[PDB]
Amino acid sequence: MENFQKVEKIGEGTVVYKARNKLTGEVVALKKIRLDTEGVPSTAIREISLLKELNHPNIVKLLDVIHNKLYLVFEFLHQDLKKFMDASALTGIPLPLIKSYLFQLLQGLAFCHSHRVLHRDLKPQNLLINTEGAIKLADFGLARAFGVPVRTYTHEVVTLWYRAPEILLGCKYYSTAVDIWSLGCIFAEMVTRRALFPGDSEIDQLFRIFRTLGTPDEVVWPGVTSMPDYKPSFPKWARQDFSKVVPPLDEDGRSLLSQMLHYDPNKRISAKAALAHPFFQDVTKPV
Template sequence: MDAFTKIEKIGEGTYGVVYKGKHKKTGQIVAMKKIRLESEDEGVPSTAIREISLLKELRHPNIVTLEDVLMEECRLYLIFEFLSMDLKNYLDSLGKGKLMDPKLVKSYLHQITNAILFCHQRRVLHRDLKPQNLLITKDGTIKVADFGLGRAFGVPVRAYTHEVVTLWYRAPEVLLGSQRYSCPIDIWSLGCIFAEMATKRPLFQGDSEIDQLFRIFRVLKTPTEKLWPGVSQLPDYKATFPNWTNYNLESQVKNLDEAGLDLLKQMLTYDPALRISAKDMVGHHYFDKIENGVRPLFEE
C-alpha cells in the first residue's frame, strides 16, 4: 500500500469503500477499491485471490483496467484506472426533457457489447451489470467496471453499506432461482441498460424479487412453457403467478428505431437458450451504421 496515497473517498461500491488515490512515484490517479470480506478474521480466501489475478489478464479498451491487487492484513485493495463519471450520473445529469443522443446510445451499446463478448469468450461473466458499473470519458469511450468480481466474491444481497443491491437488471432465470445460469444473464442486464439509455428511465424498477418478476411479466407477458421450455421447473416458479398476456415492450421504449427495437427484443428473450449472444449482437443490423467519436455532454 505504500506506493499509493489516498486522496479522498469517492463512493461506496458493492464490496466496500472506493477511494481516489495517487501512485506516489508516477503520479497516476487511480480508483482504490477496498474489499471488505465477510470473514475478516480468516484473511482473504485463496479462491478470491486466484479469480482476481485472472482479472488482471482482461485487457480491453472497453474494460476498466485492474492495475494491481494489494494485500494489507486482512484487507484487499483492487487498484483500477480512474474514471470520474458513470452512466447513471450521466443520465441523471441530462436535465428535464433531454434524452441521450441516439448515436451515442448506439456507440455505447456497441462498445459494451464488445467488452462483454471479450469476457464471455474467456468464460468470465459480469453478473452485476448496471449503469453504475459503466464508466464514461469525455471522448465518447465507455468502459465496464467490476468484471468478474461476482465470481471472486459472490454477488451479495446487500452491499456492505446494507443498501440492497439493485434487482432492476437481474435476469429472470436468476430471479426464479436457477443455479445454472451463464452468459445470457449479462445480455439481459445489458438489454435493460439499452432501454434505459434510450428512455432515461429504468425499464423494470422492482423493489423485491417478486415485484421485479411481476414488472417484467407485465411488459413481456407471463412466461409459459411454450415461451420458455423448463420455466415451470425453476425453484421459485409458481403456477399461481398472475397471467399477464400482453407484450408491450414497444410502448415502454418509444425512442428506438425498428432495428434497435428488434435487437432489444432479442436481448430480452425469456429463454436463455434463445436470447441473443454478444457475438450475434455485434453482427446485428442495428450496428450497420455506427459513428465513432460521438461525445457525451458533460463537464468533469
C-alpha cells in the same frame, strides 16, 4: 504504498479513493479491502485473478495490487453511467451515443464470455466513462470463471432491477444469458432515461417483467411451468407493444432489444451475435 496521495473519496462497498502517484503524477482509483478473520476475501481473490486475464479497451484495467489492508489499483475514469444518466435525465442521451455505449459494452462482454467469465453485476453504477467517450465494465467482485457445460452456481447474483427471470424462477443452471438480460435492462434505461424493471421484491420484479414482456408459457419458454418457484397462480398478462415500452427507439433498435430480453435463455441473443445486429450498421464514438 507511500507513493499515492489521496485526492477524494469516490464511493464505498465490499471504500474507493481517487489518488495520484507522487513520482509519476498518474491518477488512479484505490479500492481499499479490509481483512480484520477469514483471510483474503473471495471477492478480491476472484476480482484480481479474473481481471488479470481480461485485457480489453472496454474492460477497466487493473494496474497493481498491494498488501493489513489490500489495495487494488485501477486506471481512473471521472464518471459512472448512473451519474451520467442522472445528468442527462432532462435532455436525454443522444441516439448515436446510446449506440456507441451499447456497442462498447457488448464488445467487452463478448471478450469476457469468450474468456469463460460471467460478470453477474452489470448495472450502470458499475459501468465507468472517460472524456474521449469510452465505456468500460467495472466491479468484477461478483464475477466467476464458468465451465462448459455450466454447473450450478450461487443463486444470489445480479442486482434485482437487472436480475434475469431464470434466476428469479430459480433454474438450477444459469450462464451468459443472465448478463445479456442485464444490458437489455440497461439499453432500455438509456433510451427512456428510466429503470425498465424497478421491483422492490423477487415477486414484484418477476411481475414487472410479465406485465411488460407478457407472462411466459410453455410455447415461449419450454420447461418454465415446471421451474422451482414458478406458481401456476401467476397472472397471465399480455405482451405490450414495443412502440409503448421504448417510444424513441427505431425498428432495428426494437429488434435488438426484444432479442436481448427473450425469456428462454437458450434463445436470447449472445454478445457475439448482438455485435453483428443491423442496429450497429453506422456506429461512431461521440462524447
